[PDB]
Amino acid sequence: MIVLFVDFDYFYAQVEEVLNPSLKGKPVVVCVFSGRFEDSGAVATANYEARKFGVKAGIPIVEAKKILPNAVYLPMRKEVYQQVSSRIMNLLREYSEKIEIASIDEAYLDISDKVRDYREAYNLGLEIKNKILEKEKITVTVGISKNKVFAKIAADMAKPNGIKVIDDEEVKRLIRELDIADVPGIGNITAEKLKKLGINKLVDTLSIEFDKLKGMIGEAKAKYLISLARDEYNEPIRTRVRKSIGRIVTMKRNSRNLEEIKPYLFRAIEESYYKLDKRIPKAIHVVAVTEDLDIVSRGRTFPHGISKETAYSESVKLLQKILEEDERKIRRIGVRFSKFI
DNA sequence: GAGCGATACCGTGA
DNA sequence: GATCACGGTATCGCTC
Ligand SMILES: Nc1ncnc2c1ncn2[C@H]1C[C@H](O)[C@@H](COP(=O)(O)OP(=O)(O)OP(=O)(O)O)O1
Ligand SMILES: [Ca+2]
Ligand SMILES: [Ca+2]
Ligand SMILES: [Ca+2]
Numbered sequence: 001m002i003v004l005f006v007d008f009d010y011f012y013a014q015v016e017e018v019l020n021p022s023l024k025g026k027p028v029v030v031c032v033f034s035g036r037f038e039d040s041g042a043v044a045t046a047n048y049e050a051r052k053f054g055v056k057a058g059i060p061i062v063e064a065k066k067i068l069p070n071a072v073y074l075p076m077r078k079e080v081y082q083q084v085s086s087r088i089m090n091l092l093r094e095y096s097e098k099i100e101i102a103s104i105d106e107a108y109l110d111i112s113d114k115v116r117d118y119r120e121a122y123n124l125g126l127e128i129k130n131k132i133l134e135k136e137k138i139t140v141t142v143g144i145s146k147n148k149v150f151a152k153i154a155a156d157m158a159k160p161n162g163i164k165v166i167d168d169e170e171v172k173r174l175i176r177e178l179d180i181a182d183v184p185g186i187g188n189i190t191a192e193k194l195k196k197l198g199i200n201k202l203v204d205t206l207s208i209e210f211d212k213l214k215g216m217i218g219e220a221k222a223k224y225l226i227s228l229a230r231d232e233y234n235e236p237i238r239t240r241v242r243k244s245i246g247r248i249v250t251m252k253r254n255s256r257n258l259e260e261i262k263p264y265l266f267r268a269i270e271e272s273y274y275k276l277d278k279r280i281p282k283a284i285h286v287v288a289v290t291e292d293l294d295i296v297s298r299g300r301t302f303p304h305g306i307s308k309e310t311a312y313s314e315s316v317k318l319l320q321k322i323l324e325e326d327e328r329k330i331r332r333i334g335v336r337f338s339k340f341i
Numbered sequence: 342g343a344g345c346g347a348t349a350c351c352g353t354g355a
Numbered sequence: 356g357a358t359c360a361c362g363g364t365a366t367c368g369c370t371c
Contacts, residue, residue: 057354058354102355103354103355106355152355184355185352185353185355186353187352187353187354188352188353189351189352189353190352190353218351218352221352240355283347283348285348285349295349295350295351296349296350297348297349297350298348298349299347299348299349300347300348301346301347301348339347
């Protein structure tokens with residue numbers, strides 16, 4: 001098949017540049033400001049000016065301020081970015097019926113029945129870049145190959161404001177030459193683990209024994225790497241359904257008493273139901289971060305949808321089951337809702 | 342032995 | 356004891 005992947009470049013920061021173009025050319029750091037100390041939280045996305053001096057997603061805000069104290073630090077306006085993204089997504093819908101909206105900044109197009117070769121696909125990509133830039137002033141990066149993974153790899157390599165093809169010859173080279181840590185889905189935990197056997201390339205997952213791999217990284221990820229290494233990865237471009245909506249919050253002081261926790265928990269439910277909008281969940285989970293920072297979760301699934309009032313009652317029962325079963329104190333508390341109608 | 346959904350930890354940034 | 360959101364996924368209980 002022929003797959004076309006489009007990533008929005010440094011998306012949260014870019015949208016802020018578009019909404020305030022003065023920021024263009026200066027370093028921009030969109031952060032989540034979270035907890036107790038002022039400037040606590042983490043960096044969500046940096047533009048390239050900021051990534052040049054070390055500021056990147058996931059580092060603490062105060063450490064970014066040590067590196068670039070004069071950069072523009074903005075809070076996350078996730079509702080804004082989602083509205084922009086939903087508009088770009090509707091732009092991309094006019095290029096095939098087979099669209100997988102993978103995340104707020106990414107989507108996969110199956111364009112097999114709309115073009116016959118990579119040269120036509122490529123040309124379609126520039127048209128998609130041009131259209132998104134023209135109508136929304138957002139640069140994207142396109143990646144094109146025989147399946148979702150290598151199409152995304154093509155994007156990873158061409159970013160930012162780029163476009164790249166990976167043909168079947170390149171696929172074979174990359175199966176031999178690319179670093180597994182750079183395979184999509186393979187994060188740092190799993191990547192490090194693959195230094196057990198210093199598995200550094202896809203083809204290496206064929207030397208090792210299947211049960212060994214399985215026992216280190218899990219069956220799902222093992223099957224995944226094998227099928228790639230074998231170049232018999234096919235995964236249809238499907239329309240995705242949201243799996244989970246929720247909200248966690250950080251409390252001013254560690255607590256263990258229901259009545260001080262209840263207010264944060266109810267805020268989290270309120271904010272969660274706001275984002276749910278028309279979606280009715282049948283499952284709920286109370287999630288709590290402990291004073292030592294382990295996460296602990298208890299849920300219940302219902303045969304029906306969960307009204308807000310039931311969420312309120314059940315969430316308390318679930319928080320109570322948390323406080324009996326674990327003796328530690330609680331630092332953060334939230335809910336997550338799942339199993340939509 | 343194995344299907345099926347729930348569960349709660351786990352890992353990625355989809 | 357300094358991150359949130361989502362959803363991945365190994366396992367478990369129930370069951371035939
Ligand atoms: N450690 C983290 N903590 C919080 N948010 C994170 C973290 N890592 C990633 N994110 C979120 C915010 C980023 O905007 C979003 C995209 O992840 P990332 O892989 O950094 O971007 P990307 O592949 O889309 O690259 P680029 O931003 O250059 O387009 O994921
Ligand atoms: Ca991006
Ligand atoms: Ca992305
Ligand atoms: Ca990434």
